[PDB]
Structures are given as structure tokens and as C-alpha cells.
Amino acid sequence: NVCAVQKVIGTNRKYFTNCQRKICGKSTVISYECCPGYEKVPGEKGCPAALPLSNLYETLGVVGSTTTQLYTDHTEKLRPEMEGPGSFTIFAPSNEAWASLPAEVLDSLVSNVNIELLNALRYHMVGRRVLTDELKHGMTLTSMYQNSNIQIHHYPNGIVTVNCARLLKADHHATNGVVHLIDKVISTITNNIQQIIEIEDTFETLRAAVAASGLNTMLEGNGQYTLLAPTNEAFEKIPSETLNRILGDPEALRDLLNNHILKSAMCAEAIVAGLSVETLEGTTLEVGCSGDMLTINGKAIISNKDILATNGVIHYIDELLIPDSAKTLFELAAESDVSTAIDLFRQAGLGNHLSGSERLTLLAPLNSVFKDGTPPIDAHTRNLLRNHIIKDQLASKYLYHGQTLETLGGKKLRVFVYRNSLCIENSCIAAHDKRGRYGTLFTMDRVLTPPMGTVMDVLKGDNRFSMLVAAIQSAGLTETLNREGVYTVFAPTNEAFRALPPRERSRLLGDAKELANILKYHIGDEILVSGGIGALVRLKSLQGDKLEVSLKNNVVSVNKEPVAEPDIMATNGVVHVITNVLHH
Numbered sequence: 306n307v308c309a310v311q312k313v314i315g316t317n318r319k320y321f322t323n324c325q326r327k328i329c330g331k332s333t334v335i336s337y338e339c340c341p342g343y344e345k346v347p348g349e350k351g352c353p354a355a356l357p358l359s360n361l362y363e364t365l366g367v368v369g370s371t372t373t374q375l376y377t378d379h380t381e382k383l384r385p386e387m388e389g390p391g392s393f394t395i396f397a398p399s400n401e402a403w404a405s406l407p408a409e410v411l412d413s414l415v416s417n418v419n420i421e422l423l424n425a426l427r428y429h430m431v432g433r434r435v436l437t438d439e440l441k442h443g444m445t446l447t448s449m450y451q452n453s454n455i456q457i458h459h460y461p462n463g464i465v466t467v468n469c470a471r472l473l474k475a476d477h478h479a480t481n482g483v484v485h486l487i488d489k490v491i492s493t494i495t496n497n498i499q500q501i502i503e504i505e506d507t508f509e510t511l512r513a514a515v516a517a518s519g520l521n522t523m524l525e526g527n528g529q530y531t532l533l534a535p536t537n538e539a540f541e542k543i544p545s546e547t548l549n550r551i552l553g554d555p556e557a558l559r560d561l562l563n564n565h566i567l568k569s570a571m572c573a574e575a576i577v578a579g580l581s582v583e584t585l586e587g588t589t590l591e592v593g594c595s596g597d598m599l600t601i602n603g604k605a606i607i608s609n610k611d612i613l614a615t616n617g618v619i620h621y622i623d624e625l626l627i628p629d630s631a632k633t634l635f636e637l638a639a640e641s642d643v644s645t646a647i648d649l650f651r652q653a654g655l656g657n658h659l660s661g662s663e664r665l666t667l668l669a670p671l672n673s674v675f676k677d678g679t680p681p682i683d684a685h686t687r688n689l690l691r692n693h694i695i696k697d698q699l700a701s702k703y704l705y706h707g708q709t710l711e712t713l714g715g716k717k718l719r720v721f722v723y724r725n726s727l728c729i730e731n732s733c734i735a736a737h738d739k740r741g742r743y744g745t746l747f748t749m750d751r752v753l754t755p756p757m758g759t760v761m762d763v764l765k766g767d768n769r770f771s772m773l774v775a776a777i778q779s780a781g782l783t784e785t786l787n788r789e790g791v792y793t794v795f796a797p798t799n800e801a802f803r804a805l806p807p808r809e810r811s812r813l814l815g816d817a818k819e820l821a822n823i824l825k826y827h828i829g830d831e832i833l834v835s836g837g838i839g840a841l842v843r844l845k846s847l848q849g850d851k852l853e854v855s856l857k858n859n860v861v862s863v864n865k866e867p868v869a870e871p872d873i874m875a876t877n878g879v880v881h882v883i884t885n886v887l888h889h
């Protein structure tokens with residue numbers, strides 16, 4: 306028989322439930338009264354006695370809706386109907402609700418009490434008894450004023466709403482019906498979302514965008530939406546070149562308008578905590594609240610909440626919500642996790658690829674790659690960057706093994722797709738794609754090191770592996786580590802060969818075919834860059850037995866023996882540098 310109130314400290318807003326920690330970021334205190342209609346006797350057992358039912362007019366005073374009671378009484382015609390025959394509900398505004406009306410609208414009501422005040426009170430009423438049992442999301446009650454509909458919603462969290470007024474105290478039975486207490490005075494709903502946009506002067510840039518895009522027919526139509534409508538002042542915070550480029554292009558335009566529209570009508574006093582919501586374009590937004598401010602992604606950019614329409618709810622927003630798919634590469638990458646990278650592109654002359662409509666894919670590494678320093682701008686940097694800019698617009702989820710990607714600097718880089726990572730040359734994808742209108746940003750964990758020759762060119766140009774190229778020659782393996790292939794050479798240095806045991810180097814020297822078998826064991830038949838090693842991967846060697854290739858604590862190991870220098874790229878493989886020679 307017991308109930309509870311939770312109240313935010315330093316406020317007036319209270320939520321009247323049965324018997325959540327914070328709400329809109331503000332701490333709560335919970336206070337126990339018991340449910341409207343029952344009394345405390347002298348002590349006894351904890352709300353014993355129920356009060357008698359009174360009829361709907363007197364029930365108004367019992368719930369605390371004395372202004373609604375006073376206004377009803379001063380019409381001389383609704384009060385006798387309220388205390389006589391029938392079955393009724395009234396969604397009765399609180400005392401604070403009438404006082405929160407604008408002076409100009411409340412004067413209009415109380416100066417004509419037999420028409421406009423009576424019409425207002427009749428619109429809050431339904432000619433049948435309707436409990437919150439009968440209230441489910443999306444349904445329309447018929448009011449007693451001129452058959453006008455009342456919009457009610459019922460959100461997951463338990464908040465009932467009635468024309469986007471929160472229902473405060475529910476289900477107070479009358480002898481001829483029920484009384485509900487709501488916190489707004491509500492009014493008739495006569496316009497669709499399209500029709501409001503064509504009336505308000507604050508939306509003339511919005512109405513033209515809708516007109517250019519052909520979304521008028523949708524916004525005239527049925528079903529429920531939320532419009533995060535941008536004012537003219539929102540469109541003026543966007544620089545002219547950026548905005549005209551979006552609005553000019555039909556795809557970018559419809560992506561923009563759909564990023565301002567939700568699939569269900571939700572309204573502001575239903576928002577009590579963080580709720581991720583998708584727009585029609587596909588982007589998730591973070592809708593919260595801080596005080597009585599609505600917040601979008603933690604920004605109090607909503608200046609006018611709960612503007613009502615027959616096909617949904619409009620909230621006015623102050624900043625345009627431009628999605629990734631309407632942005633250029635520069636707009637989607639400059640104030641982000643690849644900020645250091647994009648500054649290097651523009652300083653090295655390559656900025657005009659990123660700033661317009663060129664269909665590109667960008668491989669920009671993370672900012673933690675450049676924590677220890679940044680390379681200087683020269684010929685060699687701006688040629689290397691020019692090879693991180695790939696022709697055509699790509700999606701990484703659609704890349705395939707042994708795909709080749711042309712750069713703007715003439716190279717062809719190889720896509721290697723492994724089970725837990727995707728790699729282009731040595732570099733691997735570190736975060737999700739950012740798909741813009743014209744180009745897409747791939748987010749990388751290394752600066753990439755493109756191949757500059759063959760496996761034999763790596764080894765003959767480096768003096769650590771001169772005993773290895775001699776063994777490769779003496780096993781007849783030069784001509785095949787130099788033609789086209791996909792190898793993984795675990796290449797032992799000179800000090801590895803001079804480390805060899807007597808019985809193993811005697812098997813190396815005394816038969817050229819046994820030397821061929823030991824060197825073919827060192828060579829994988831796939832390309833396995835370090836970014837494609839999981840916990841452990843088995844790798845078929847050209848001898849035929851498998852190699853055990855792990856990555857623990859950022860060191861590649863092969864059969865539990867360490868790689869000193871991973872990922873030296875080559876036009877027909879990858880070279881990893883090992884410090885000793887593998888056995889059998």
C-alpha cells in the first residue's frame with residue numbers, strides 16, 4: 306500500500322512512482338508519501354484507510370489540481386457535467402503548469418471563460434475512463450473539444466506522456482471516472498512536420514533544403530518522426546564553400562537532412578539518461594540531458610523543445626549535424642585521431658586531394674605513431690605521403706586477399722587480409738572507416754614502408770645477410786627468391802651462421818640438397834606481415850613442414866625464437882630478420 310517520490314535537489318521536478326541514481330546529471334533524494342487517496346489513521350500499520358471516491362470535479366482538488374478546479378468552476382457549465390452522469394478522464398494540468406503558460410496566452414483564456422477556457426479544459430478531457438493500462442505508445446485519444454486528438458506515448462523507461470507533457474500522478478479514480486495530473490497545459494495539434502517548416506521563418510533555409518531534396522512528401526506523410534530541426538542560425542555557422550557543396554549535391558543533401566530525423570517520435574521529458582539513437586542517414590547520436598537542457602552528443606544545442614505535430618515531434622537545434630558521408634576528407638579528419646597525419650599532407654602540398662571531390666582513399670596513421678617526433682617536409686616525405694593516397698573510394702570491409710591498390714604516386718600496394726586484421730603492405734587498419742561523400746579515410750597503425758625491390762635485393766643490399774646470400778647461391782635459391790612470388794623469409798644474419806653448431810653446419814656444407822632443404826624451411830609460402838599474426842599462426846614452408854609464428858609483447862617469434870627486425874617489405878615477399886638458424 307506504499308509509494309515513493311524521487312526529487313532532484315534544488316528543483317521543483319518530482320517523479321511519482323511506486324516504491325535510478327542520477328537523473329539528467331543531477332543527484333536525487335527519495336521521499337516516501339503513500340499513494341493519492343489513502344490516509345495514515347492514528348499510527349496502525351502504514352497507510353490503512355482509503356479515502357472515499359469523489360466525483361471528477363472534487364477529485365481535481367484531491368489530487369492537487371486546484372487551478373484546474375477553479376477554472377472549471379468559473380465556466381458555469383463544465384462543473385455540473387463533471388459531477389453528473391457519465392464516465393470521464395481528465396488530464397489535469399498542475400498548478401505549476403498554468404503558471405508556466407505565457408502571459409499572452411493565459412490572459413486569452415481567462416478573459417473568455419465560457420469559450421476559450423472551456424475549450425481548453427474540454428481538450429484535456431476524454432469522454433470515457435482511460436487508465437494507464439489503456440495507454441500504449443502511439444495511440445490517439447479523442448478529446449471532448451471538437452473531436453481533436455490527444456497524442457499519448459509510452460516510452461521504455463515507464464514515462465507516460467500526453468502531448469509531450471509528463472504524466473505526474475496517475476489513476477486517481479473518480480466516482481464517474483479518473484483524474485491524471487500532467488505538468489503542461491496542452492493544446493490542439495493541427496500541423497504536420499512539413500506544414501510547421503513552411504510557417505516558421507526560422508526554418509526558411511531548412512524548408513528550401515527539404516524542397517531541393519524532395520523530402521516534403523515524407524514530412525507531409527503519416528507515421529512518427531523526431532525532427533532535430535536546424536534554424537537559419539545553425540546553417541550560418543557552416544562556411545559558405547562547405548554548405549553550398551553539400552546542398553548542391555543531391556546525395557550529400559539527402560544524407561544531411563536524414564541525419565536530422567529519427568524513426569520514432571520521442572520527446573524531451575522522456576529523456577532521463579543517455580540514449581543512443583540512429584538517424585535515417587545511419588549515424589548514431591548521443592541524446593542526453595543536463596538540467597532542463599536537451600543535449601546532443603553532450604552539447605546543449607537545443608533551444609526549443611517539444612514542438613508538436615500530427616506526424617511527430619520537432620526540437621529546434623542550433624548547430625547543423627553534418628554527417629561523415631557529406632564531408633570531405635579534410636573535414637572528416639582534421640580534428641580527429643589522424644590530426645598529426647593530415648597536417649603533414651597539407652604542408653607537403655597534397656592538401657587539395659583531401660579538400661574536394663576527388664574520389665580517393667586515404668591511409669592516415671594514428672597520432673601516437675608521431676609521438677616521438679615528426680618527419681621533415683622534403684622530397685622524400687612528400688613522395689611517401691603521395692603513396693598513402695589511393696585512387697578510387699574504397700571500403701576496407703570489402704577488400705580481398707591479393708587486391709592491389711594504385712597510389713597517386715604510381716605504386717601498387719598489396720592488401721593482405723588475415724582473420725583478425727587487415728593490412729596494406731606493412732601497415733594495418735587500426736580503427737573504423739570514415740566514409741565521406743567523395744573519399745574515405747582508413748585509419749592506420751604504422752607509417753607504411755613500400756617495397757623497393759626483391760628478397761634478394763633486400764639481402765644483397767644489406768651486409769648482415771652476406772653469408773645467407775652465399776648459401777642461397779650455393780643451394781640454387783637465388784633465381785627463385787628473385788622472381789615473382791609471395792614469401793616470408795626469416796633471414797638469419799652473419800652472426801647467426803657463425804653461431805651454428807658443428808653437426809648442423811656439417812649438414813649445411815656437405816650436401817647442396819640438404820642446404821636447399823634447410824633454407825626452404827626458412828621461407829613461408831604466404832606473405833605474413835607482423836600485423837597479421839594472431840596469438841599463433843602456422844605457416845607452410847617451402848620445405849613443407851609448418852613454422853610456428855607468434856606475436857607476444859610486440860616481438861614476432863618463429864618457433865619461439867625472436868625476430869630482430871620484422872616487416873622488411875619486398876616486391877615478392879616479406880623479410881624478417883632472425884638472430885639464429887632454425888632447426889628442422
